[PDB]
Amino acid sequence: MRLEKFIHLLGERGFDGALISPGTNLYYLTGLRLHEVGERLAILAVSAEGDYRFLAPSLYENVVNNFPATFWHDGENPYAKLREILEELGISKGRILIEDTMRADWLIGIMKLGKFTFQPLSSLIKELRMIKDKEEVKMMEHASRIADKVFEEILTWDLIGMKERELALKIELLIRELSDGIAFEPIVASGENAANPHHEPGERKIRKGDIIILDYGARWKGYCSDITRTIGLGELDERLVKIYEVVKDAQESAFKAVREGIKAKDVDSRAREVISKAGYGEYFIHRTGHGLGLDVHEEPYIGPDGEVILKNGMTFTIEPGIYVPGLGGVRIEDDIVVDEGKGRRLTKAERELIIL
Amino acid sequence: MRLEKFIHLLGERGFDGALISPGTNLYYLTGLRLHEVGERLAILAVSAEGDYRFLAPSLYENVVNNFPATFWHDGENPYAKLREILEELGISKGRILIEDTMRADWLIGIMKLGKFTFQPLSSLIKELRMIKDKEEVKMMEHASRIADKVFEEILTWDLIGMKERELALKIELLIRELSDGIAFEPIVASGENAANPHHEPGERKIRKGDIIILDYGARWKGYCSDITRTIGLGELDERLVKIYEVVKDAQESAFKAVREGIKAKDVDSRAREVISKAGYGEYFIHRTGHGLGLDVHEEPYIGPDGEVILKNGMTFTIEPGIYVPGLGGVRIEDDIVVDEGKGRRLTKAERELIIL
Numbered sequence: 001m002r003l004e005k006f007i008h009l010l011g012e013r014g015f016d017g018a019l020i021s022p023g024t025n026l027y028y029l030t031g032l033r034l035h036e037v038g039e040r041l042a043i044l045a046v047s048a049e050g051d052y053r054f055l056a057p058s059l060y061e062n063v064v065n066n067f068p069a070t071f072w073h074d075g076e077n078p079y080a081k082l083r084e085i086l087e088e089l090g091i092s093k094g095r096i097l098i099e100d101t102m103r104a105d106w107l108i109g110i111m112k113l114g115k116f117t118f119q120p121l122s123s124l125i126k127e128l129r130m131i132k133d134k135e136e137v138k139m140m141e142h143a144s145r146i147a148d149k150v151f152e153e154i155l156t157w158d159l160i161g162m163k164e165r166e167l168a169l170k171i172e173l174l175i176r177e178l179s180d181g182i183a184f185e186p187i188v189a190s191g192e193n194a195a196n197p198h199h200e201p202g203e204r205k206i207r208k209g210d211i212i213i214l215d216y217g218a219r220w221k222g223y224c225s226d227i228t229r230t231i232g233l234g235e236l237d238e239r240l241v242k243i244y245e246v247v248k249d250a251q252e253s254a255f256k257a258v259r260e261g262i263k264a265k266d267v268d269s270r271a272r273e274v275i276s277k278a279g280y281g282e283y284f285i286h287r288t289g290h291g292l293g294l295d296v297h298e299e300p301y302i303g304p305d306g307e308v309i310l311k312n313g314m315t316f317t318i319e320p321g322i323y324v325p326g327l328g329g330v331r332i333e334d335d336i337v338v339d340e341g342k343g344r345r346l347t348k349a350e351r352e353l354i355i356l
Numbered sequence: 357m358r359l360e361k362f363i364h365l366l367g368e369r370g371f372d373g374a375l376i377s378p379g380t381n382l383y384y385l386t387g388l389r390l391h392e393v394g395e396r397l398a399i400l401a402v403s404a405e406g407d408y409r410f411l412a413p414s415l416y417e418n419v420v421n422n423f424p425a426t427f428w429h430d431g432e433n434p435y436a437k438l439r440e441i442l443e444e445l446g447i448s449k450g451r452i453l454i455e456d457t458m459r460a461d462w463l464i465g466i467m468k469l470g471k472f473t474f475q476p477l478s479s480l481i482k483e484l485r486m487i488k489d490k491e492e493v494k495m496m497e498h499a500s501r502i503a504d505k506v507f508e509e510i511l512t513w514d515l516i517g518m519k520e521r522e523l524a525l526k527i528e529l530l531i532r533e534l535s536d537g538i539a540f541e542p543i544v545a546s547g548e549n550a551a552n553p554h555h556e557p558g559e560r561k562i563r564k565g566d567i568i569i570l571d572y573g574a575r576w577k578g579y580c581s582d583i584t585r586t587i588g589l590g591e592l593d594e595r596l597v598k599i600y601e602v603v604k605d606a607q608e609s610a611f612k613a614v615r616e617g618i619k620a621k622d623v624d625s626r627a628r629e630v631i632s633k634a635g636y637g638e639y640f641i642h643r644t645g646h647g648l649g650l651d652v653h654e655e656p657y658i659g660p661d662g663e664v665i666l667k668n669g670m671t672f673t674i675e676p677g678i679y680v681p682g683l684g685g686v687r688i689e690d691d692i693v694v695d696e697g698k699g700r701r702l703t704k705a706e707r708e709l710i711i712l
């Protein structure tokens with residue numbers, strides 16, 4: 001049904017076709033999934049008329065099921081074969097949508113097969129992927145359920161002495177155990193390192209007294225979860241305990257505001273104001289949230305620049321944070337789904353400050 | 357030195373400039389490494405005139421040290437700022453090289469900043485990276501020794517009943533313990549799965565009478581190792597025991613032929629002929645090898661179509677293999693450097709058939 005909706009939407013927006021290399025969008029529209037495609041040209045070509053063909057390396061004739069295809073064997077010019085395909089479908093010229101993540105070398109090669117006008121596929125597909133259907137929500141529900149479970153397990157561990165990279169690897173192995181895989185490289189940021197929202201787990205040793213930001217996500221049948229919890233080891237510096245309660249308040253506040261009809265930026269503003277009123281406005285160095293589904297980061301964005309009007313089915317995160325250089329940081333993130341016109345938490349893990 | 361040789365090459369070869377997104381090429385040239393850049397425009401613009409600038413999101417500010425950079429903040433149009441940069445370096449039009457792995461959406465945006473003709477960066481940079489300098493060989497040397505340590509370690513584990521996926525995981529973890537990380541996902545193909553060169557480790561349990569292909573690699577300061585060894589658990593089918601002797605002699609032959617001044621395909625022909633004369637010509641479905649360095653796969657390619665004239669400093673693999681359906685397969689792979697006009701094994705793990 002999706003591929004057909006996409007096709008109708010293609011015409012409604014004036015595009016003649018689309019070229020979609022493997023990845024989340026391809027999967028979304030067809031269920032097709034190729035293992036490590038790398039350099040080998042693999043492309044779903046779609047016409048606004050209704051026809052479509054998937055060009056792929058002979059090596060994938062098994063995974064493609066019976067999806068209309070045309071294979072190319074090594075020694076052949078994938079680009080020439082694509083050109084023929086573009087002709088049969090009648091799109092060897094015109095405005096063509098291009099998968100956002102496709103390799104530049106493939107696009108360069110595609111540029112020689114005809115005279116086209118290009119635009120990123122996301123500019124149009126986001127309209128469909130932003131509103132999750134019932135099954136997609138169920139899948140995200142389980143991914144979030146697993147993220148909750150992983151958190152519970154982490155708390156039974158003895159963190160002291162562990163190095164960030166080490167804790168992150170344990171989290172990662174657990175996620176790979178409980179799910180289809182990590183949604184992204186887990187992030188463990190301890191002590192003063194928690195002050196960097198984009199910290200990359202390293203050699204720092206976790207010690208008593210350290211605040212720790214735990215950020216990770218699982219994947220279930222392709223759908224992602226993305227959670228973040230901040231815990232403390234022993235007694236935390238008093239300045240960080242105060243900060244925590246503030247972020248907690250901001251996150252719950254932003255969540256309650258979630259309603260069908262409000263702009264994404266208003267949700268961000270609702271968490272933003274709580275943090276400003278407490279005097280930490282300058283330390284909240286990022287958007288309040290981002291959407292998720294087949295990817296960790298997708299529409300709609302929950303920042304001061306989010307223009308999307310929330311609607312039932314949309315899924316995104318709420319994770320305001322406060323980062324103080326030389327001291328640390330705190331972030332509390334939940335995956336939220338707009339349901340029955342109201343915000344509903346997909347992740348249930350403990351929100352109160354936990355001191356191991 | 358590298359960047360200046362690249363700039364010199366840009367001019368000699370006819371190009372006006374290059375735009376390089378994060379990845380191995382950006383690293384080779386500048387030592388710059390950006391963790392999970394995702395969708396944030398990060399580009400190194402380089403003019404043939406010697407001028408260069410690095411546009412990166414403000415979050416990588418400290419990681420880029422003293423490199424000439426212009427940073428942008430979430431909420432701005434980094435494409436607008438790239439335009440200004442192309443303006444001052446004098447490359448808002450002309451023949452530009454594009455990082456092969458750059459996202460299509462970035463390229464598409466770049467396309468709106470001027471009239472260009474593009475060509476993949478690798479077509480030119482491959483001329484530099486193919487010739488490894490002393491330190492690069494040193495790094496790969498450590499990477500290869502770590503691949504050998506891993507082999508020795510594998511021989512002490514009890515493999516009976518262990519699933520392929522499980523052994524692959526252990527190899528992965530040991531490699532991550534001993535080095536900077538895996539070069540690619542370890543491969544374990546047991547029994548008849550050893551017949552498929554592209555086999556992906558599954559749930560099949562390793563049992564006696566099984567031959568097992570072990571294919572994995574390590575990373576050391578960015579440089580890769582890629583080794584392959586085939587072992588046997590208990591007593592194997594006599595056919596396989598001889599198929600192994602052919603591969604061994606074949607592998608050693610191609611290694612002996614490695615000399616400065618010979619065409620790549622000739623090293624391949626050498627291993628290839630030893631196998632044909634033994635009668636298994638049709639069960640050797642791939643190139644004898646490929647070059648490696650910052651990436652697992654790079655120039656020169658050691659196959660029937662290999663046109664490169666081997667010179668000192670080149671690093672590639674010699675890994676011929678025999679794959680017979682319903683029976684199994686065997687591959688022995690070493691990483692080789694052309695040193696003093698002769699071939700030299702970087703990987704030295706035991707090549708004789710070992711039975712556990």
Ligand SMILES: [Co+2]
Pocket residue numbers: 215216226227228333
């Ligand atoms: Co997170």
Ligand SMILES: [Co+2]
Pocket residue numbers: 226317333
């Ligand atoms: Co997140």
Ligand SMILES: [Co+2]
Pocket residue numbers: 582583584673675689
């Ligand atoms: Co290999």
Ligand SMILES: [Co+2]
Pocket residue numbers: 570571572573582583584689
């Ligand atoms: Co290998």
